[model samples]
Target: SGAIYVGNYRVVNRHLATHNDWANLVWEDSSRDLLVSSTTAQGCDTIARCDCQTGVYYCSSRRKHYPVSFSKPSLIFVEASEYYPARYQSHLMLAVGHSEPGDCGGILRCQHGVVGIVSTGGNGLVGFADVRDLLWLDEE
Candidate 1:
């Protein structure tokens, strides 16, 4: 229960596009660096740590870059949403949309068979959002 200020369409468009760009880079391919690359991502300008070298997570000091590591969350089938804040965490759900570009489904990294990566798209393979992965890690 709050307020939203939507005046300039351009500003809003840019903001949403930027978030998508970040999500694609991190979640789609954790092996690749989430470095905001307009030169590469076609005007999706941003920067992040080098998560490219073999699919491992590391932290960068940019603060906003913190979300990079948790971009693609591990799967959780429970009826609930998870929250992990970044320095500039905008939007409540962090721009959650369908994964059309990447695996086309959510990624999950759950350990126990009862509670591991789960997606709305039934199980065969699973990927994870960065937050879920880290949260599970924190629990362990």
Candidate 2:
């Protein structure tokens, strides 16, 4: 996973998907060079998907900035919960009470590997869509 710094927009692009919470960003201004870099996203096994484990997970986002710059990564200790099958079949919506409003779309990682991408946060919980569920460009 990686974040892109374009003219006035700072966004994340990891996979191709269609949904209200997901989008594919494109930088078309040829004159200005766009900067992009990969972030940490470790792979894990299926058992770790919904298993309750304890550890400090890391996440980052471009908080409120005029031109949008990267902010210091934040840490949160949480355990994996059951998969949200109704709304996010393959997503892991953990009960993480530390993530903020702007933390959505950032990558979540721990010692085991990537937890997922931040999807939504509210009521003392954060939803993360599994990175493994994302559609890779090379797959097609």
Candidate 3:
């Protein structure tokens, strides 16, 4: 989403980008354009993007800085892989969009035409880091 790379197969070149507000990918390759062809599965390590105009293609199951905006479920990335969100499945996915603060807020949105609001939890302070500690961690 943020950083751009070519093929991204070189060990030295490394993965250019990862999660962002508007992450994307193209399924194939071409000279003047690219197409959106990506699959999201468990541990979606691949990061991709497409030419806004041409819609060519590139693939990278790499990791990068995925900008988070309007963070609804603030206390995320700190839970197991099988709880409330762990047991949930959604159309929402994570990707990078922009690199400017207050520029785009780097958020998750409808990608490739798919539209929906996907998040771990939007319970405000209720689903907080401290909240989980009070409920689950306290027992430990």
State which candidate has the highest TM-score: 2
lDDT by residue (tens digit), candidate 2, 1-100: 3332223333342322224213333322111111123224422222123333333333454342111112122233333333112232223446444455
Model 2 TM-score is: 0.37
Best by lDDT: 2
Total backbone collisions for each predicted model: 19, 1, 18
Per-residue lDDT over 66-139 for candidate 1, one digit per residue giving the tens place of the 0 to 100 score: 11122332223322212211222111111222222122112222222111111211122222222212222121
Model 2 accuracy (lDDT, Cα): 0.35
Task: Write candidate 3's Cα lDDT for 15-90 as tens digits.
Answer: 2223431154433122101122223322212222211111111212122323232322222332222223233221
Candidate 3 shows a clash count of 18
For each candidate, the alpha-carbon lDDT, in order, equals: 0.21, 0.35, 0.21
TM-scores, one per candidate: 0.15, 0.37, 0.16
Which rank order by TM-score, best down to worst?
A: 2, 3, 1
Residue 117, candidate 3: how far off, in angstroms? 1.9
